[PDB]
Amino acid sequence: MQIFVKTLTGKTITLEVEPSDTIENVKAKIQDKEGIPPDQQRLIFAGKQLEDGRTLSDYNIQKESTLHLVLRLRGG
Amino acid sequence: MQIFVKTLTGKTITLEVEPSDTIENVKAKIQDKEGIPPDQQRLIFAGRQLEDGRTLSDYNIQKESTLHLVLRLRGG
């Protein structure tokens, strides 16, 4: 399916994903186009903070959903 | 008078207020129009987090000032 991620700048990127994709897999896709390390990304869906180790299907994210990408600070 | 409240999706809520309205009162107006409980709301103006018992004029919030609404992120 496709989904969309909105960044800080107002950029919207489209990702091709599968419901079995983890949050980590999606953050890797985002790194691949916007340079942000997975440990400095937090993805938000309908105001909910998504967590590593869960899949898009766990959160019932289905086609053309929008995620909001937020900065996460790296520990030390 | 009117004030604006910017939200994470980029949307702008417009509120009719008076200078003597408290920060509590502004979070209550947001709840009435948007459905967001006041305890989930943090308001930011001029680089500072607004405290519940101040008035708008205490913070020099003026006609057509904009605040930033930053919600608590939800689990699950």
Added chain:
Amino acid sequence: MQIFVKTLTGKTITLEVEPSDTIENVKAKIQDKEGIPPDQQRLIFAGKQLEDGRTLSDYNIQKESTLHLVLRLRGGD
């Protein structure tokens, strides 16, 4: 060398620094221009909070890098 700092109101200020300057020195630089007490300054570079006792070079901050001042929210989750 110069570096830049973006304040909580989105103004960008310029600092003259040397890589061996401590974060604490940098915060005193900021105060000398904007009035922000170091006590209330929290700086980030490249997604990392800067510790007062470390140097700019410890964080790889270069000429014309931009730091951001950040606000810790009261009662954040």
Added chain:
Amino acid sequence: XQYWXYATGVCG
């Protein structure tokens, strides 16, 4: 949502 900077929340 622990932090804020001009003009966006930040997690940290």
